[PDB]
Amino acid sequence: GSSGSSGSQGDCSYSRTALYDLLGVPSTATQAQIKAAYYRQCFLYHPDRNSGSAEAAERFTRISQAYVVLGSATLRRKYDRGLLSDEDLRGPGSGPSSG
Questions:
Q1: At what angle are helices 55-69 and 73-81 packed, to 10 degrees?
Q2: How far, in Å, CA of 89 to CA of 69, rounded?
Q3: Exposure of 15 by Cβ count < 10 A (0-12 exposed, 13-18 middle, 19+ buried)?
Q4: Calpha distance 12→1 (Å, rounded)
Q5: Transit peptide among the record's keywords?
Q6: Secondary structure of the chain: what % helix, strand, coil (to 5)?
C-alpha cells in the first residue's frame, strides 16, 4: 500500500457522504466520474453472473442508490442544502401518463 498508515475512526451517524464512498468519488467529484464509477460497480457484479450471491445482492442494492441521489445534478444540490428526503429516495411518483 502506502507508507504512512493512518488510524481508523468511525462516526455512528446518518450517512453523510456514503453514496460518494460506495463508488469512490469525492464529495466534489464530476459527472464524468460519478458515472464512470457507477458503471465499474456493475461490470464487477452483473445480474446474470451472480446466480445466487448473497453479499453481492445486498451491496448491489446499496450501490444503485449512489447512482440515484447523485445520478442527477439537481438532487445532489438538494441533499447539499438538506432538501433531499425519503420521498425522493423511494420516489412514489410512478406512472407516466399515456393513453
A1: 90
A2: 7
A3: exposed
A4: 27
A5: yes
A6: 50, 0, 50
Domain 17-91 has CATH 3.60.15.10: no
Which residue bears the cell 442527477?
Answer: 72
Residue ranges covered by each domain of the chain? 17-91
CA proximity to 14, closest of 71, 99, 89, 96: 89
Q: Give the number of other Cβ atoms within 10 Å of residue 22's Cβ.
A: 20
Q: Which three cell numbers stand for residue 35?
A: 458515472
Report yes or no: 59 and 45 within 8 Å, Cβ to Cβ.
Answer: yes
